[PDB]
Amino acid sequence: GTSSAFTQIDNFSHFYDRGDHLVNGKPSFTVDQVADQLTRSGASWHDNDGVINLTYTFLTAPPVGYASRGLGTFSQFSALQKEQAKLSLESWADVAKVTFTEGPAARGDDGHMTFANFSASNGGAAFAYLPNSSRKGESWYLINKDYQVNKTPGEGNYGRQTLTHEIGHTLGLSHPGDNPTYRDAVYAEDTRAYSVMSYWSEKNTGQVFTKTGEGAYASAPLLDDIAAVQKLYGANLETRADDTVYGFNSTADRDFYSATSSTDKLIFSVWDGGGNDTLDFSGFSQNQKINLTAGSFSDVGGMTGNVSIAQGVTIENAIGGSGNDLLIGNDAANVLKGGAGNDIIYGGGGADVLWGGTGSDTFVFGAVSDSTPKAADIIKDFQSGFDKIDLTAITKLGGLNFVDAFTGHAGDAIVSYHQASNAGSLQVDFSGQGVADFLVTTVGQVATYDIVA
Numbered sequence: 001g002t003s004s005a006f007t008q009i010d011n012f013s014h015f016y017d018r019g020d021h022l023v024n025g026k027p028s029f030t031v032d033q034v035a036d037q038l039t040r041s042g043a044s045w046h047d048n049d050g051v052i053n054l055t056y057t058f059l060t061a062p063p064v065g066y067a068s069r070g071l072g073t074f075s076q077f078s079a080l081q082k083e084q085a086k087l088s089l090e091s092w093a094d095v096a097k098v099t100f101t102e103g104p105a106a107r108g109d110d111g112h113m114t115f116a117n118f119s120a121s122n123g124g125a126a127f128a129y130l131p132n133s134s135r136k137g138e139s140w141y142l143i144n145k146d147y148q149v150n151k152t153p154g155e156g157n158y159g160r161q162t163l164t165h166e167i168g169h170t171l172g173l174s175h176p177g178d179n180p181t182y183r184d185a186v187y188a189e190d191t192r193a194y195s196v197m198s199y200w201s202e203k204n205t206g207q208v209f210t211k212t213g214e215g216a217y218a219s220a221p222l223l224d225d226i227a228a229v230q231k232l233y234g235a236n237l238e239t240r241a242d243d244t245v246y247g248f249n250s251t252a253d254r255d256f257y258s259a260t261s262s263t264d265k266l267i268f269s270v271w272d273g274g275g276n277d278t279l280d281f282s283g284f285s286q287n288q289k290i291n292l293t294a295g296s297f298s299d300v301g302g303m304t305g306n307v308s309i310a311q312g313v314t315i316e317n318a319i320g321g322s323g324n325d326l327l328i329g330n331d332a333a334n335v336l337k338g339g340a341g342n343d344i345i346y347g348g349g350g351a352d353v354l355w356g357g358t359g360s361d362t363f364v365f366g367a368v369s370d371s372t373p374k375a376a377d378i379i380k381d382f383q384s385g386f387d388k389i390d391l392t393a394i395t396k397l398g399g400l401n402f403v404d405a406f407t408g409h410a411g412d413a414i415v416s417y418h419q420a421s422n423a424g425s426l427q428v429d430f431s432g433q434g435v436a437d438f439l440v441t442t443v444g445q446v447a448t449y450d451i452v453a
Ligand SMILES: [Ca+2]
Pocket: 240, 241, 242, 243, 244, 272, 273, 274, 275, 276, 277
C-alpha cells in the first residue's frame, strides 16, 4: 500500500487518460485517433514553400448570386467582429504552419477566405465550407433581433468560439461526427472540453467550466484541434520559442491565455515552440491540479478538465495557487511551487526545484529515478514538523532504517544537516548496495519523522 498523498497523485495523472477502453459506452480516442477523426474529409488547402499562406476579406458588398442563398440581408463585418476574427485566425496560425493576411485574392496565395453576415434566420447561427468545395474559405454569420450572439464576440463567449469553429472548418477540420445528441457521438471525448469543433458540452465528459446561467467557451483551438490542424499543416515551432509564462503574470500575449483575477474562467490548451516555460495559476484560491505532462489535463481556477498542454510540448514549471493543489511534473528539470496551502508536489524525472510555500506541503517520490544522488531534487523552503517527504510509492510502507552510515542493508536512510548553510539531505539505500541510490536535498531541517515510508 501507498499513502493517501501518493494515490491522489497517481489518480490525477490517470484521471483523464484516453484510448483503449469504453467511456459512456463509446470508445475512447487518443488525441491521434481524434486528429484522424477530425480530418476525415481529406479536404485541405494546398501548397512547395512548406507553409500555407491564406488571404481574407471582410466582404463589403454581397457576392454574385448572393440572393440565391436565401440568407436575406447581407451585412459587412463590424470592427468588433473584424478584431475578434483576427484573434481567432491568429490562434490557429500559432499552432499550425498557416498564415492569414487581410487582403484581396492574390496571384501568389494558397487560397482566399471571406467573412460576412446575413440576416435571415433560415441560414443558421453560422456556417463555413470545407477547403475543397466551390465556396471554399467562406464563413457566414447570422445577425438579427432574435439572434445576437455573433454581434458581440469576445473572449470566453460562443460568439468568439463560433469564429474559431468556422475558421477551423474552412481550414479543413470537420465536426467530430456526422435531433442528434452526445449519445450519437462516435467517441467519448466529443465535447468542447477537447475540441472547439464539438456540438456538445463538457458535462457529457464530466468536466465543469461554469454553472447554470453562465457561458464559457474556449476562444482558441483546444487539445484535439491543435493535433488535427497540425496533422494537416504541420506544427508552428517558431511561436513563443522564448520563455513564456502562461496564466497569471502571463507573457503569452493572448487573451485566452491571460488571467488577472480569482474569478477568471480559463479554458485553454498550451502550444509553445520551445524555451523554458511556466504555468502560473498563483492568483487562484481554489484547489487546483496542475499536470505538466505533454498532452495531459489540469483542473484550473476552481474548474476541471479546463487546461491542457498540447501534444508534443514541454512546459517546465508550474505555480499552484493558495489552495490545496497537486503539481505533477515531467522528465525534465521542474520548478514546482505549491505557492500556498497544503499541497502535494511530484517532481518526476530529473532534478527538480520544489517550493512548498507556506502551509504543510508534501513532496512525493514514486521512483528512485526521480531523486537520484547524481541529479537530485531540492526543496528550497522545507519546514520540518509541518512538511513531509513521501517515499511510500517506493517503500510500500515497509519503513526505512535511519542510520548515521550505510550498513549495506536495503532501506537504510540518512538524514544529514549542515547548519553552516541551512541544508539537510535525505539519502537512501533502496538496493542495499552499500551506497546511496536516492538523495533529496533541503534548505531547512528535515527530521526523521518528516519522512513517510
Ligand atoms: Ca516558450
